[PDB]
Each structure stands twice: as structure tokens, then as C-alpha cells.
Amino acid sequence: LKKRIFAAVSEGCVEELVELLVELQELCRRFLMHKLTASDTGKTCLMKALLNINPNTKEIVRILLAFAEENDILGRFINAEYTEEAYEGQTALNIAIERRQGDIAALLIAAGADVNAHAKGAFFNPKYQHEGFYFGETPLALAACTNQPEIVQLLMEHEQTDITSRDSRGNNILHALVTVAEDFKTQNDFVKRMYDMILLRSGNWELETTRNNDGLTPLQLAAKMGKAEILKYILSREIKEKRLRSLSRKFTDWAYGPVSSSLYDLTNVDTTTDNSVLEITVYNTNIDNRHEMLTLEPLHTLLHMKWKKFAKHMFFLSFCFYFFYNITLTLVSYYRPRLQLLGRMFVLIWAMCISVKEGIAIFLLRPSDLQSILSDAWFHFVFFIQAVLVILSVFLYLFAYKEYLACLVLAMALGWANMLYYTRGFQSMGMYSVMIQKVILHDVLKFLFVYIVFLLGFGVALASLIEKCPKDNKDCSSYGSFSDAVLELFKLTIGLGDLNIQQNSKYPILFLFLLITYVILTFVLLLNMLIALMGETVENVSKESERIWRLQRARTILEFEKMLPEWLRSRFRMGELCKVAEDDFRLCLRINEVKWTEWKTHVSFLNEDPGP
Amino acid sequence: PLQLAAKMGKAEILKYILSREIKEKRLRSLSRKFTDWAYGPVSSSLYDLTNVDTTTDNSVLEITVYNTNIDNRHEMLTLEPLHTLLHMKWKKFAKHMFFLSFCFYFFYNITLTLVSYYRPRLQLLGRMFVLIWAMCISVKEGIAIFLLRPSDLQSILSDAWFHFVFFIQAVLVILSVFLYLFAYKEYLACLVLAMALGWANMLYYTRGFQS
Amino acid sequence: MGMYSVMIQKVILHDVLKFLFVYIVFLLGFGVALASLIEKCPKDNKDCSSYGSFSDAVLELFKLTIGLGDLNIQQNSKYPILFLFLLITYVILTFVLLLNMLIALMGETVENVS
Amino acid sequence: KESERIWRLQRARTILEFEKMLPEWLRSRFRMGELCKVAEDDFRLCLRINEVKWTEWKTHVSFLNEDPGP
């Protein structure tokens, strides 16, 4: 049948294939040859010969080119596609490049091929980064995603390459290289090298400024995908060669031995436009790589300068105003009778103010914030509950009810628990204040579940173990109910109570047995609390404490920018040069660094002599 | 030799055999792992679990799991035809048979709790849900308590002490019920321990959660 | 003895005051809450509720922290259960705060030992 | 290494024990393939496992099915 072609091409028998290829042309006497196709997939002879790369395959492709040109079938032969799910548009060039074959790929390119074929398949478009292989839907980003630079060089030298072509997902070559840079331990660093090579050969500012279908750029895509290596390369990209210096971002202003001034270009990194690089790399809880990605110079020094410029004055003022509000709430109920009347409105209009600002920011956030453990979302819950309790208690006090010391007492009970949140301003106190939340959210509830189970099991046992008093003694056995037994057992746990043998029971020794084994089990359970502490802190010491705190501080600085108006945004960066490059350069930032190891002669500095 | 390497803890030979791929002709039938396809980084391998899956007596997975005499079970179970087999089995039928068992035991334990504390000193159906279930445990555990090798008790954790605890709990329940019915009045002596130990068995069902 | 006598000063100057600040904040917040939570006695009972003043409530809470006092439910209040709720959550918060003392110890000694 | 590795062994033992508490008609959840195509003899079962590697670079010629697709 037609399977004789498929078996022949997979074994490399050139003589056996040419034995019948000379008579298949005369078999049909002349025309959409369905023999070299597939109703399920859509294969061709030339395309199939390239998947099973056998050591004698150049002659097969050569005789296939001769067969293609002699029967005038190259349009539907060298440029074909599949017609089933997950595969569309996989031409011959999309596999010859894939099999690390350069000579056959160059032969197909010399025949014309497709070059800009869009392999728009569902396997090529996986839902996540593990169920499929997304390379860029073109036989140019396929060679760039792989480690083949020679095929990229000969492809970009073609007159029909169209390097600025857009993938059907809206991506580009730089977007495709960004999406596949998983890490350095499992991928090395060739992705950055291919990014630099393709960017240099493009030689213009249209690949980096191309907007994705998600409204993103390769810089912003690398920021949102956690690609710290590519982000570090782009933000610190310096090109000393002429005609390509406009593509660089970091410009060395001057250098005098160890000290040198670098003028980073934060024209898209600073939070001056919607969805900047800093805003994306801070407001993205779906990536864990935010730990080391925020440490880059145009981000780290930007956050430091912002904190030392306006965030400090807006954090101290907020803390002191909240402290005054909390102490006013404290001495308005304890000193309240059962002029200093102004203290009853400072807690009322401020509760309304919190109800407004928090009440609108409580829900204007992505659900992924609640997916993590610490994303500044639980504190929104606590502040909203405190404000709601204050206003509800005030309204209860005014109109009808008398619960003004039931829901209000909790107002300072939770309000004075919110002063711990404002410790993020101190480095040391902020370091101490992070595992307070972490240990509760991870380890304490683990013991709480087992301790509640032990309390429930022993509570119903000891309550039923007593002799039910005939009401001769009113407060009989001190374990009359399940709640009383639970209270007594918890009191015994914290070492405050009584362990009297005579508890007015039918079996005193069994009650004693249960009490002793409860103490032993509680002691073991409490020991495992320190054990779980050992299991979690000692691996990521100095990395789960202050690194997340720095992320919280950066988020606080970014949040403080939103609570100021347009006229207050006059604290932008420096330069406004329009001198480093021909186009209107927007902003720049100066960073100094001293190094006593590298020794070189610098020739690519910007300003001839130093001086800030 | 595959089962011998599984029972002797030879993790290196087991890894070689279970991932044995031969690309040469006339010798490809001796291989076990067959690469179905490969497209760059992603590739599909068709492992041959014709003797590894638990479809016959003393399979490779059953041997490498039910062998407490080897300590090398720690890293030997991490091989692909074993690790992915256990993951798929857990996500196919073991999850539904673990949640159902935990919820049924939770209902049994809470029924036992509010049948003695609320007992006078219709809701009468709670006195038989603890009786026929105690008989059921007495049967299934009562036959599996002794059908095991003595080497299980040689180790520290081999799912053998929990058999003791469950058997003691069921025995205490039935003995207390029979004491309550016929002659004695110790229905709050050996029974109070029934929920004292029964609520200590809910800790065992925490194996479903990773944390 | 000189080796033992150096971290006596170091731990006080670094870690103890960290917990002292938070414990004082917790004492102040719970002290004003529990003092106001009681029912103000009409002087029928002279030493009423044992939590009459803010200072008395602070003293009783610190006594409960070191495991010496009383955890009686009936404290002559309008809401006994709310007083019980605040006492229980105070003990839980104090336990977490005390656990973080050993945690801070882990964060500083184990890197620069000897 | 002494916390979750033994727990994984306990989980595997629990899965193996759950297989014994079901009857013959419920053992219809076997693996896939039933090929008798990879080799001349009657091949019984097979299991598909996928893996991504960004380090090794080679030309593969010994794959089973010519084009991919599950």
C-alpha cells in the first residue's frame, strides 16, 4: 500500500527508495498525489524524511528535490502543513532546523522554503510551561530557542527573514526568547547570547518596543515572568560599538580608576507610565523569583531613593497619625463616664476615612494575592474589620442597643494589634515582625488542630467519666459539662488549676489515668512545636526573614506613590538629556561603583571629565 | 533479576533496568523504556510496566513497597515507572477511597462521642452505628492483624502499631457494649477509653495532606 | 565564665527588648480592654472583679503570663465570654511571642558561633 | 529526609493497601497501550512519561511514533 514510502524513508535505503520513486510518477500517468500524504496528519515524503534523521539522508533529500522539481510539485510539497489537533503549519523547515541539521536546512532555504511559516498549533501553544513546547511559531525563533546560532545567522541574512514578524500569540523573537529562559542551572546562558545577537543584528528600536497582545514588551515580559537573568542583562546592557550604542541602556558617564558613574536609562523602568518595569516586578505575586530580581541596580537604587525622598515622610506621618488615633480610642472608653469631648469625633471621622480608603481598596485586587501567604492582603482584612467594628459599635451605642462595650472593646483589642504592622519602617523590628506572621500561618495552626482534637476527645471522656451529681452539691466535680472539662484541661495545660484526685467520680483512678496521659500527650505535642520550627527556619535562614520584608517595603513605597496627586509627582529622575542618542531621551539615573579587581582602559565614557 | 533487585534494595540496577533503552536493531526488544517521540526539550517515553504494575502476584511495585527488611526503599521508590505509577493511582482511586474512609470514620467517631455524653443517666439509631462498625473493624482488622511477617514489628514504623491501636479500640467498644448489656456496669470504664483512643486515631488519617 | 558572660549583655541589648516592646504593646492594648470590659461595681464589693483599674488588669495579665494567678470565668462582668475570649487570645498571642524569642536566637547565634 | 521520605513510603503503602480492598470488576483502571507493535511478541502494557531538558542537545532517531501527539 502507501505505507511502503513511510517504511522506506525511515530506514535510509536510498537505493530501495529510488527503485520505486522512478515508477510512482508513471503510476498515476501524471496532481495532488495522495500517496505521499496522510488523512490523519497530513505528512509529505520530504517532510517525513527529516523526522527520522538516518546517517544516509542527504541523498534522500537530494533525490526528493529532484522528484519535486521534475513533477512541478513544490508548492504543496516543500510548504505543507498538518490538519489535525495541536499541529498546524509545521513545514519542512520547521523540522530540519529542529533536528540540529544545518546542511539540509540551508538546502531547503536555497530552494525558497517558507522561512516565515507560522506553526500555530495547540502543542506549540501550551496552557502552561510544562505540557508543551512553545518556541515562537516560526522557523527563526525555533533555532534561537535551541542552541543553534549558525542557522540563526544564515536565516537572518536572508532577504525574506522578516525578523520583526509577530507570532499569532502577539509575541516576537525577543518575546519568545524571554519566555523560554527558564533558569541558568538547567539552561545555561545561551538564551541571553542569542538575545544579544538578534538584537544587534536588528539594529533598531522596534523589537524591544513592540507591544505584545497582552500589552507588554520583552522588558516587561521578562519582569512579569521572573526572568531575572534577561532582566539583569537588559537593564545593564552597555554597547561600546558605534551605530549600535543607541540600543544600550546603561551608559558609563565617566570612570576614574575604581570609581565610575553609570547613567542607567529608566525611560520605561520608572513608575511614570502604566505597567512599568518596577510596578510589574513588585505587583506580581504569581512569581517567586521576585526575591533576587528586585536587587538589580535600576530597581534597588530607585526604591532606596524613593524611600529616602517621600516614602519616609509618608510612613512616619501615617504611623504617628494612627498612633494618635489609637491612643485617642483608648482614652475615650476607659476614661468614659459610666472640654475633652473632641475625642469622640477623632475616632469617628477617621473610622469613616479608613472605611473609604480601605473600603475601596479591599476588593480592587487580583485573587492571586490571596493565593500566597504574605501579599499585604490579610492586613487589609484586619484594618477593615477594625474600622467596621468601630463604626458598628458607635451606631449601636447611639440609636438602640447597649453593646457599646462588646464590639468596641475589640476595637482597641485589634487596634493595638495593628501597631505591630507599622514596624516595617525599622530594619531590625521589621526583621523581627515577619516570622510573627509566618509561624502563625505555618506552624501554630498545625499544633492548634491536634490540640483541639485532643481537647475534644478528652473533654467528652472526662465529662462523662464523672458521677452525675444528684444536686446535693451544686458545683459538683468541677467537670460537670463538656465546656467545663475543656476549660479545666486547657487550664491544666498552661499550669494553672488543680490536679486533685478526688473529683467525685465512680472511677477516680481512670480519671487520673486520663489526666496523666493527657499531660504526657500535650507535652509531646508541645515538643513537636520546636521540632517543626527546626524543620523550617534552619534551611532558609537570612532568606525568608528580610528578603520578603524588603518586598513588603518596596510594595509600601509603590503604594505611597498612588496616594499622592499629580502636582506632587515633581520628584522624577534627572538628566532630560537628548544628547546620548539622536532621539528625545527621557530620563536617566546615576549610579556609582568602586571595583579594585578589574583593570582596563576605558574609552566609552559619556562625559569626558568626571564630576556630578 | 528485576524482582530480585527490587527486594534486595539494588536501586542502581533497578534504575538501569526500568530505564533500559536500546536503540540498536535486533536488540531493541530487550529494552524497557521506549521513547515515543521527541521535539526538542519535551519527549515522551513509553515505559514497559509489563511486570512492574500490580497486576500479578509479587510485582516490582508490590515488592519494592512491601519489604521492610531493606532501608534502601528511601531512594528506590523514586524511579519513574514507580513514582508516576503511585501518583496516578493516588489521583485515580486512592484519593476517593481515603477521603471516604476518613469521613466515614469521622462520622463513626462523632456518633460514638454523642452516644455516651448525651446518653441518659428518635435518635436511637446512634447505638447501632457504633456496634455494626465495631464488628466490621473487628473483622477486617481482626484478619489483617496477624497476616503479616514478623519483620514488620522489627522496624519502628511499618503500619503495624496502628493495627494494634485500631484493634484495641474496636475490642474495647465491643467488650464495653457486651459488659453493658448482660451483667456488668463498667459501661463507663472501658468505653470512656473508646473515644479517648478513637479521637486519637483521627491523627492517623492526616497522611492525605502533605503538610 | 567570661565566655558565658558576654551574650548575657548581647541578648538583652539585641533580642529581649524586641519582645519587650511587643509585649508592652500587647499588655497596654489588652489592659485597657479588660479593665473597661468589667462591670463597674457599685461598691457593694470593695475589691470588685480584681481588674478594677488599668494597672490592676496589667498586673493580672503579667501574672497570668508567668503562670501564677487565676483564670476564673466569673469575674463580675457584663460579658463573661468576651472576657474569656480576650484572655484566651492573649495567652495564645503571648505564646507565639515567646516562641519567636527562641526564633530570633536562632537567627543571630547560629551564624557567628565561636 | 526522615520526615517526608518515610511519609511517602506510608502513602505508597496506603495506595497499595487500597488496591486489595476492591474487587476484580473494579480493576478496570489498568495502564494504556496494549500495543503488540513495539515488538513481535504480544506486548501487554505501557506507560507514557514526559520530560523537558534544556541542556542535552542531540539528534534523536530512535523514537517510536514518527510525529508527536498524545
Ligand SMILES: CC(C)=CCC/C(C)=C\C=O
Ligand atoms: C502579624 C503582625 C506583625 C501584626 C498583626 C497582629 C494580629 C493583628 C494578629 C497576629 O497574628
Ligand SMILES: CC(C)=CCC/C(C)=C\C=O
Ligand atoms: C502517632 C499518631 C500521629 C497518632 C496516634 C496517637 C496515639 C494513638 C498515641 C500517640 O502516640
